[PDB]
Design a protein around this ligand. Structure first.
Ligand code: CLA
Ligand code: CLA
Ligand code: CLA
Ligand code: CLA
Ligand code: CLA
Ligand code: CLA
Ligand code: CLA
Ligand code: CLA
Ligand code: CLA
Ligand SMILES: CC1=C(C/C=C(\C)CCC[C@H](C)CCC[C@H](C)CCCC(C)C)C(=O)c2ccccc2C1=O
Ligand code: SF4
Ligand code: SF4
Lengths: 108, 41, 731, 30, 107, 80, 36, 107, 161
């Protein structure tokens, strides 16, 4: 209660920073695509924003079954990597890859 | 029993019973006399 | 008065950012300014009016200049149906190469295509070359300079008119009727006969040769001999090719009726005769009032004489002359109401009775013009009621109007408001109920159970004007009717050809969907009127706030006491009614656009069947027609509709941002701004800089206004993008 | 087509209109 | 795999019976998405009679909870000192509610 | 500064004075009512315009009226 | 010199220079303590 | 998002009339309606509504009847609560109908 | 006929609609065995569809180009079954409801606790009063003539004008 002003002012600034950058990515992309400048977009085929930390974690979890969880025979979840699990011709789970679009949405 | 009857006499309980009864008779009329687009029979 | 705003001591001493905002928002409320007198008020308004007219003429001169300089008007004239008229060139350094190419289709350089109908209008009135347009632009630029000079001059001490001059009703009305309207209409007839009609007949008449090129071979001899029928003999034939001499006649005044067969627009001779008769009517009308010559009526005597002898109107109209004369707000309310009616009539009559050549073939322009004028009409009607409410707060004197019609409105305001509420509730209940019943029965796959009332009364009106489709043998649809035998003498053949021609918009065929949508429109009109009327009639006070007139037209609230008083002012009624005006005009324009899109697409039956339930509107109008708009740009490229896609999203964003101001209120924001001030004061290297106007949250009324402006701008931009992109990307 | 001279003429007329507009604005301000 | 799960059926009235979809298994109804069939199959439920008995027990437990609420408000209401037993409450809810619940479900 | 007026329907109940958060109002002697006192607003320079005084007033219509006007630091309730 | 050059000349003046100077002038006017 | 997610995937919910999914199209529409209905409460204030109720109470009194439980516009806080409740019901129910029609089609 | 319409019993589009609806129902029915409850339910739906289409055919209902019934509500008695007679029924029922509600409110206005009687209904008085609704128009006329329906303005509150 005695430093509420500091807490709220810093949270306000964090919100402005996050909102401006995360949503400005989308606004920038809409403007670039509308102007016929796809090569100037934030995208995989352009200026990239790769979620490298999430990808690093995904690789670690994919490698876990034999090494850091040696008694586990398979991964905790196929979303991290591995084969496609197929049931009745439909996909039950398969690796969920993370790129620029996933970066933008996670920051949203 | 007087107190319970007075509770049943409160506005929401009576509205619920009355609207349920009205809805029931509308539903039954449409069950036995369906598709009345006007009084043509 | 030592700081901005110098017109308000109270605002100039506020130490917060509020001082700036309110200054801007109160600059044109000249009555409230410090030290204002009535005479100075009228003089400043006069000068501001000169400035506004200068702005209008600059805008028109600019349209002419940009078309002349950068448009394709000569190519359009040579080939109207296969050219897209240009508005102006694009120069935008942010464009990519793809965008430049996309926006330069059909041309060598990027352009915007005009949807204002300027090409069709200028073509109809006789413009043929870029040089003529440029000359018009130059003339209007000079005229704007003249108006600016006049505005400056009438503020000089020897040229400021007196209050008596501004309050001379009879003379101003005489001059505005006979001169501003009647003589302007006569001069326009002169232009049509000398310039536009010859241009339509493949003959050049300009400043070079008009003194020696009579607009009729018989000259003015028939006019002065009273043998006027000569001017009607030999009209353009049914094979007349517009802009050429083939099939042309020589009539300059006619009453043909209907449309020119090739342009599908009104005959130029018919329009010339219309303006000549109008000129006579208005010049005659402008001689009614007494100015300086003994003859004529006095308006005060007219008003005071009209009291019904029975007494059901009480004192009658006594007191109204002084009330109107001394209240600029009542005068403005009357002007805005009549202008709103006239703008709606413009929208309704231009689509049906096409006045300009080839305009009915420019579908996007038709949609844009109708939507534009209907939205402006809505704004004008809302303004009329807002200024009525302002009049009630600031100008109405109960003793001057004692027992007159104006006071008796206040006397039965409760009956008026309650009955308007009953009408609104009835329309809403039954229209929404019928739509929902239809939606439900169609959802359960039983469309034959729909309730589909035939708009029999309107179909009867159409038949009475001659429409044969509905099998009503009444009046002009009846061969033996007296109306038919009389009308066949002048205008009936052309009118009957047009009205029974399904390719025209003259009395479009209607059915049950038209019935339901019309009752929805009536709901919108009644609710908007209810809000505006209750605001005006409760502007002076109510049971909840009996002394409301002491607090002014606009004020936030009267606090949380007495149960709570948010949005109690008359300004708040204006604010609430803006939403209903937008919703109503939206329903109107949605109806117009969907009916026309299905007509233009060759399948009216889609509207006729799917407009009877809401899902039909959502799916077959909005969803189906969103397609070209949303693909203006996509992962594969862009086309020239990408600007409309961007504007569509822009409008959605602005509308949603307005929601923030409308829903979240002041206290939250003020507390947040307090922490912002703390942060800035305590941050090194940034506290070297300080504000000189204390940051505060926006005020209660200011936030309502800002939310309303964001809402309205988003609404308008979204719909404009949709209507333009959908119509132009489909056809 | 509109010549360069005609464009320059229009711009001069615009400049006149702009100075008259500034004059009127300052006058209304008083 | 081919049969759509459905556990709600609507009566034929005013045409609403169209909501009884052709979900397969000689059965018409609404396709339900709350996962009941998967949970029941995971539990070992193979017959509708087992479901009926689970429903009967659910009714019995509902009545028991209602009586317990009446009893602990009107007949035997604990004192505030009883409620202020954070330590004992945590011990019971961890070991008894969560621990024994997990042990019995594993059983 | 805001304007605060007392009308002669005041019954001297002292409720507006107790409600005021910034001490704008005070009770003064008066022979117009049974209680022998009327409300007064000598310190309108400190009035924030909260209208708690109006919420507290028991008469119909109000006997104390707050009309909002020219804003100052004091009337805007600024700590900065 | 040609009129076709005017957009690339005038557009930066209308859309960048003019708003900046107008906004600076209005800021200076609203910050002025004694205007009359 | 507007084109490839909302516009594209709304196809099932808006084309559901006349099938077993028609309840979803109806609920889609009704949720839109309730969401828009909430904005009346969220954007307005009770002073206006109380003043309108005065005119309506007048009409009832003009025919010699009126409740002794005097009608009042909702409180400020209740106006906010009602507006928010209808907002959440409308928006969430719209997403509910949309998701369910889409997912029943794709499963 | 009226409005350039045609009787649904003479409308090809109407009969096409009937055939299409029946065909879709029977196509659905064809996927099951003849004795399955889905089949019986679908065939009952088929019968109800046919009965509805036939009932609309035998009526006076008019049909537009779409093959759907349209209602005539200009006041003609030849179509009175579409708006006028249902409207009579609605006015009668709604006047009954409103008259009995107003009567009950006025009756309990003089009770010991009028407000309590609005949130807790005196059921016997309410049922007695509700049974008197059937002569609501006559009662309304008598109340109007006896000056009990309409109050005076001097007795009704208003706000300052
Ligand atoms: C889509 C409509 C919309 C938008 C754009 C906003 C925007 C915002 N809201 Mg609001 N809000 C909304 C709807 C919206 N809200 C509604 C409907 C309500 C009622 C429930 C609220 C109630 C509400 C509350 C209670 C709060 C907010 C807050 C905020 C701010 C969050 C901080 C931030 O990210 O700033 C960044 C700005 C943006 C994200 C907007 C666009 C950013 C662009 C794309 C990038 C930067 C552009 C840059 C400025 C250049 C501009 C160029 C220009 C000069 C031409 C942000 C300004 C909060 C706040 O103020 O926190 C600090 C806050 O507490 N809002
Ligand atoms: C609210 C007004 C209302 C009215 C007027 C009726 C009237 C009727 N019901 Mg219905 N019913 C109602 C509500 C109502 N019900 C409700 C709320 C339910 C629970 C869903 C039912 C469930 C029900 C069943 C299961 C049956 C009836 C049946 C009947 C009919 C019985 C005739 C008889 O034997 O005596 C009669 C038309 C019987 C029937 O129609 O047999 C063919 C019958 O079997 N009703
Ligand atoms: C508010 C406008 C409105 C109107 C005028 C109607 C009118 C009708 N609806 Mg619709 N409907 C509406 C709104 C409306 N509905 C809404 C909001 C929904 C969504 C819930 C529906 C969904 C719906 C369905 C799914 C169906 C209807 C049906 C009907 C018809 C019922 C015939 C009937 O039962 O009479 C006989 C019943 C009475 C007269 C009740 C009174 C009985 C008392 C005892 C009479 C005593 C008099 C003395 C009637 C034409 C049905 C129909 O057949 O369409 C052709 C039908 O199946 N409606
Ligand atoms: C005959 C001489 C004459 C003329 C030509 C004018 C002209 C004008 N005066 Mg006026 N004035 C005059 C005499 C005259 N005045 C006299 C003698 C007095 C003193 C008694 C005044 C006192 C006066 C004042 C105080 C003001 C004016 C203003 C104006 C301008 C009005 C705005 C405008 O430009 O709209 C022109 C509009 C048109 C030409 C088209 C009008 C069409 C409208 C929409 C009506 C259409 C209706 C349609 C025909 C039929 C009805 C529709 C129905 C079918 C539904 C206009 C230039 C105002 C101004 O702005 O000055 C700077 C102003 O404030 N005048
Ligand atoms: C309602 C009346 C009316 C209207 C609106 C028009 C409108 C038009 N006429 Mg028509 N005309 C009319 C009546 C009218 N006319 C009459 C009664 C006749 C005689 C029968 C004509 C005969 C006629 C001919 C022969 C021609 C036109 C043309 C035109 C078009 C271009 C005019 C132009 O160059 O604009 C610019 C504006 C002006 C020329 C007038 C304003 C001039 C300003 C005020 C100059 C300023 C003077 C000041 C001293 C400057 C210095 C001071 C300042 C710098 C401070 C335009 C559509 C021309 C056309 O192209 O048709 C297709 C054309 O060749 N008209
Ligand atoms: C789509 C959203 C929406 C809807 C449906 C309404 C509806 C209404 N507005 Mg509102 N309004 C809105 C948005 C909306 N408004 C917005 C965004 C604003 C800006 C703040 C306003 C500002 C406003 C003002 C200033 C006024 C209105 C008024 C009205 C009433 C007009 C008369 C009428 O049509 O009665 C018919 C009633 C309806 C259409 C609503 C009922 C909906 C269904 C049919 C009822 C179903 C009940 C259901 C069976 C029971 C619940 C089921 C279950 C929960 C138990 C109507 C209730 C006016 C009024 O009060 O007039 C009397 C009025 O003066 N509105
Ligand atoms: C029809 C349009 C119109 C008219 C007739 C008026 C008239 C008036 N305004 Mg208003 N105003 C307007 C629109 C208008 N305004 C708009 C759109 C805004 C923004 C919301 C304002 C905001 C505003 C404020 C804040 C104030 C006024 C004030 C006034 C009054 C004093 C005159 C003045 O402001 O000096 C005119 C302004 C100037 C002379 C400065 C420059 C503008 C000139 C005319 C043109 C610019 C030159 C040109 C663009 C150069 C191009 C260069 C480029 C090519 C490089 C006068 C009654 C003032 C007042 O005192 O009220 C009583 C005041 O304080 N107005
Ligand atoms: C309005 C509240 C609400 C509603 C209507 C639902 C509805 C549903 N839940 Mg959900 N749930 C909720 C809140 C709700 N949930 C909350 C707040 C949580 C977080 C604890 C969960 C966690 C949850 C789980 C883990 C599961 C459901 C499942 C379901 C579905 C099956 C219902 C069932 O009987 O499964 C009965 C539940 C089970 C058979 C599994 C329960 C396992 C958990 C871990 C037991 C925890 C109990 C414990 C004592 C709680 C104390 C927590 C502790 C930290 C103090 C149904 C759609 C089930 C499902 O999706 O089936 C297809 C499912 O497995 N829910
Ligand atoms: C008021 C109507 C109007 C409007 C909205 C425009 C708009 C435009 N002009 Mg055009 N212009 C106009 C009149 C107008 N013009 C007139 C009458 C002339 C002849 C002098 C020109 C001469 C002109 C040239 C040579 C060029 C433009 C260009 C442009 C474009 C970029 C802006 C620019 O740099 O121009 C600069 C404008 C000037 C140097 C003169 C401006 C003269 C007008 C009368 C000023 C209007 C003031 C206005 C009424 C004040 C009120 C607005 C305010 C209250 C919001 C933009 C579309 C550029 C372009 O086409 O790029 C593709 C360009 O190169 N204009
Ligand atoms: C519309 C609206 C109202 C008016 C709405 C009111 C008074 C609600 C009315 C609720 C009804 C009376 C209860 C439910 C009853 C049914 C609608 C009809 C049944 C009638 C009887 C059986 C009781 C407010 O009072 C209000 C207050 C503050 C902010 C916004 C608003 C707001 O938007
Ligand atoms: S408005 Fe508030 S601060 Fe002002 S006198 Fe009343 S209670 Fe005191
Ligand atoms: S103004 Fe009102 S609250 Fe204050 S003393 Fe007088 S009656 Fe009491």
């Amino acid at each position: 209660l005695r430093h509420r002003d500091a807490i709220i002012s810093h949270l306000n600034w964090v919100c402005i920073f996050l909102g401006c950058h995360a949503f400005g990515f989308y606004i920038h992309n809409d403007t670039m695509r509308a102007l016929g400048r796809p090569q100037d977009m934030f995208s995989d085929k352009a200026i990239q924003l790769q979620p490298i930390f999430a990808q690093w974690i995904q690789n670690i979890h994919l490698l876990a079954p034999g090494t850091t969880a040696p008694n586990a025979l398979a991964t905790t979840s196929y979303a991290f990597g591995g084969d496609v699990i197929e049931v009745g011709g439909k996909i039950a789970m398969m690796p969920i890859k993370l790129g620029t679009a996933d970066f933008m949405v996670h920051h949203i | 029993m007087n107190d319970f009857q007075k509770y049943l006499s409160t506005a929401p309980v009576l509205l619920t019973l009355w609207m349920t009864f009205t809805a029931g008779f509308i539903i039954e009329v449409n069950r036995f006399f369906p598709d009345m687009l006007g009084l043509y029979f | 008065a030592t700081k901005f705003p110098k017109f308000s001591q109270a605002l100039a001493q506020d130490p917060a950012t509020r001082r700036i905002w309110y200054g801007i928002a109160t600059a044109h409320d000249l009555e409230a300014h410090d030290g204002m007198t009535e005479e100075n008020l009228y003089q400043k308004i006069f000068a501001s009016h000169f400035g506004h007219l200068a702005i209008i003429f600059l805008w028109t001169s600019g349209n002419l200049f940009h078309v002349a300089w950068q448009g394709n008007f000569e190519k359009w004239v040579s080939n109207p149906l296969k050219t897209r008229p240009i508005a102006h060139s694009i120069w935008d350094p942010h464009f990519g190469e793809s965008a430049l190419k996309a926006f330069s289709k059909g041309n060598t350089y990027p352009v915007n295509i005009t949807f204002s109908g300027l090409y069709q209008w200028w073509y109809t009135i006789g413009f043929r070359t870029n040089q003529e347009l440029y000359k018009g632009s130059i003339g209007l630029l000079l005229l704007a300079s003249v108006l600016l000079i006049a505005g400056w001059l009438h503020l000089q001490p020897k040229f400021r008119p007196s209050l008596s001059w501004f309050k001379n009703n009879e003379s101003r009305l005489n001059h505005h009727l006979s001169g501003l309207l009647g003589f302007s209409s006569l001069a326009w007839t002169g232009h049509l006969v000398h310039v536009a009609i010859p241009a339509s007949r493949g003959v050049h008449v300009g400043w070079d040769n008009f003194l020696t090129t009579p607009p009729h071979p018989a000259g003015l001899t028939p006019f002065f001999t009273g043998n006027w029928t000569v001017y009607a003999e030999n009209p353009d034939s049914a094979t007349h090719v517009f802009n050429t001499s083939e099939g042309s006649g020589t009539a300059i005044l006619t009453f043909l009726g209907g449309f020119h067969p090739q342009t599908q627009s009104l005959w130029l001779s018919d329009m010339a005769h219309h303006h000549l008769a109008i000129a006579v009517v208005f010049i005659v009308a402008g001689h009614m009032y007494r100015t300086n010559f003994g003859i004529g009526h006095n308006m005060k005597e007219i008003l005071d004489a009209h009291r019904p002898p029975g007494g059901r109107l009480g004192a009658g109209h006594v007191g109204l002359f002084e009330t109107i004369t001394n209240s600029l707000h009542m005068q403005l309310g009357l002007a805005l109401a009549c202008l709103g009616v006239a703008t709606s009539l413009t929208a309704q009559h231009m689509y049906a009775l096409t006045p300009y050549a080839y305009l009915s073939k420019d579908f996007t322009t038709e949609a844009a013009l109708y939507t534009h004028h209907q939205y402006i009409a809505g704004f004008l009607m809302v303004g009329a009621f807002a200024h009525g409410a302002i009049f009630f707060v600031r100008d109405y004197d109960p003793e001057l109007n004692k027992n007159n019609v104006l006071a008796r409105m206040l006397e039965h305001k409760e009956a008026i408001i309650s009955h308007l509420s009953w009408a609104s509730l009835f329309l809403g209940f039954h229209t929404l109920g019928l739509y929902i019943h239809n939606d439900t029965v169609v959802a359960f796959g039983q469309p034959e159970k729909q309730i589909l009332f035939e708009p029999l009364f309107a179909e009867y009106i159409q038949a009475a004007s001659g429409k044969a489709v509905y099998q009503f043998n009444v009046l002009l649809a009846s061969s033996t009717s007296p109306a038919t035998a009389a009308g066949n003498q002048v205008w009936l053949p052309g009118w009957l050809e047009a009205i029974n021609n399904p390719k025209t918009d003259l009395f479009l065929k209607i059915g049950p969907g038209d019935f339901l949508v019309h009752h929805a429109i009536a709901l919108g009109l009644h609710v908007t009127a209810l809000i505006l009327v209750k605001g005006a009639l409760d502007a002076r006070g109510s049971k909840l706030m009996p002394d409301k007139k002491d607090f002014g037209y606009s004020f936030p609230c009267d606090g949380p006491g007495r149960g709570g008083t948010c949005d109690i002012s008359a300004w708040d009624a204006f604010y609430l009614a803006m939403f209903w005006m937008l919703n109503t005009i939206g329903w109107v324009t949605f109806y117009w656009h969907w009916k026309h899109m299905t007509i233009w697409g060759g399948n009216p039956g889609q509207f006729d069947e799917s407009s009877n339930y809401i899902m039909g509107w959502l799916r077959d109008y909005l969803w189906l027609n969103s397609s070209p708009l949303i693909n203006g740009y996509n992962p594969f490229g862009m086309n020239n509709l990408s600007v409309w896609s961007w504007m569509f999203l822009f409008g959605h964003l602005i509308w949603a941002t307005g929601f923030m101001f409308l829903i979240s209120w002041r206290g939250y924001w003020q507390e947040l701004i307090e922490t912002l001030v703390w942060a800035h004061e305590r941050t090194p290297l940034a506290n070297l800089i300080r504000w000189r106007d204390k940051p505060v949250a926006l005020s209660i009324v200011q936030a309502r206004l800002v939310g309303l402006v964001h809402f309205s701008v988003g609404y308008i931009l979204t719909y404009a993008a949709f209507v333009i992109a959908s119509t132009s990307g489909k056809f | 087509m509109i010549t360069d001279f005609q464009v320059y003429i229009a711009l001069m007329a615009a400049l006149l209109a702009s100075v008259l507009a500034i004059r009127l604005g300052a006058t209304l301000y008083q | 795999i081919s049969i759509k799960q459905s556990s709600q059926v609507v009566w034929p009235i005013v045409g609403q019976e169209i909501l009884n979809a052709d979900v397969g298994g000689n059965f018409q109804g609404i396709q339900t998405t709350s996962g009941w069939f998967q949970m029941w199959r995971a539990e070992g439920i193979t017959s509708e009679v087992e479901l009926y008995w689970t429903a009967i027990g659910g009714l019995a437990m509902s009545a028991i909870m209602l009586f317990a609420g009446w009893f602990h408000y009107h007949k035997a209401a604990p004192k505030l000192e009883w409620f202020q037993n954070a330590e004992s409450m945590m011990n019971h809810h961890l070991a008894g509610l969560l621990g024994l619940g997990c042990l019995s479900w594993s059983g | 500064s805001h304007t605060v007026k007392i009308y002669d329907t005041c019954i001297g109940c002292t409720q507006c004075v107790r409600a005021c958060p910034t001490d704008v109002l005070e009770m003064v002697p008066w022979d117009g009512c049974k209680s022998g006192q009327i409300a007064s607003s000598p310190r309108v320079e400190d009035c924030v315009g909260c209208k708690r005084c109006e919420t507290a007033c028991p008469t119909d219509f109000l006997s104390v009226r707050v009309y909002l006007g020219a804003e100052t630091t004091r009337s805007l309730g600024l700590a900065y | 010199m040609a009129a076709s050059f005017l957009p690339s000349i005038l557009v930066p003046l209308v859309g960048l220079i003019f708003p900046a100077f107008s906004m600076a002038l209005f800021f200076l006017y609203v910050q002025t303590d004694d205007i009359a | 998002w507007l084109r490839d997610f909302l516009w594209s995937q709304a196809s099932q919910v808006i084309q559901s009339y006349g099938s077993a999914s028609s309840a979803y199209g109806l609920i889609f529409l009704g949720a839109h309606f309730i969401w828009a209905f909430s904005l009346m409460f969220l954007f307005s204030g009770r002073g206006y509504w109380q003043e309108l109720i005065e005119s309506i109470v007048w009409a009832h009194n003009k025919l010699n009847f009126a409740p002794t439980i005097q009608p009042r516009a909702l409180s400020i806080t209740q106006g906010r609560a009602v507006g928010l409740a209808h907002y959440l019901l409308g928006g969430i129910g719209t997403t509910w109908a949309f998701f369910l029609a889409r997912a029943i089609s794709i499963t | 006929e009226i409005g350039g319409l045609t009787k649904c019993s003479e409308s090809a589009a109407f009969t096409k609609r009937l055939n299409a609806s029946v065909k879709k129902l029977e196509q659905r029915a064809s996927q099951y065995e003849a004795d399955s409850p889905p089949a019986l339910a679908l065939k009952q739906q088929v019968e109800r569809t046919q009965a509805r289409f036939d009932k609309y055919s035998r009526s006076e209902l008019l049909c537009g180009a779409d093959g759907l019934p349209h209602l005539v509500a200009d006041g003609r008695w030849s179509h009175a079954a579409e708006f006028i007679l249902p409207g009579f029924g609605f006015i009668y029922i709604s006047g009954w409801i409103g008259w009995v509600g107003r009567k009950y409110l006025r009756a309990v206005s003089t009770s010991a606790n009028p407000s309590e009687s609005e949130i807790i209904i005196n059921v016997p008085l309410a049922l007695k009063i509700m049974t008197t609704g059937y002569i609501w128009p006559i009662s309304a006329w008598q109340e109007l003539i006896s000056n009990d329906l309409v109050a005076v303005s001097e007795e009704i509150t208003v706000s300052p004008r």
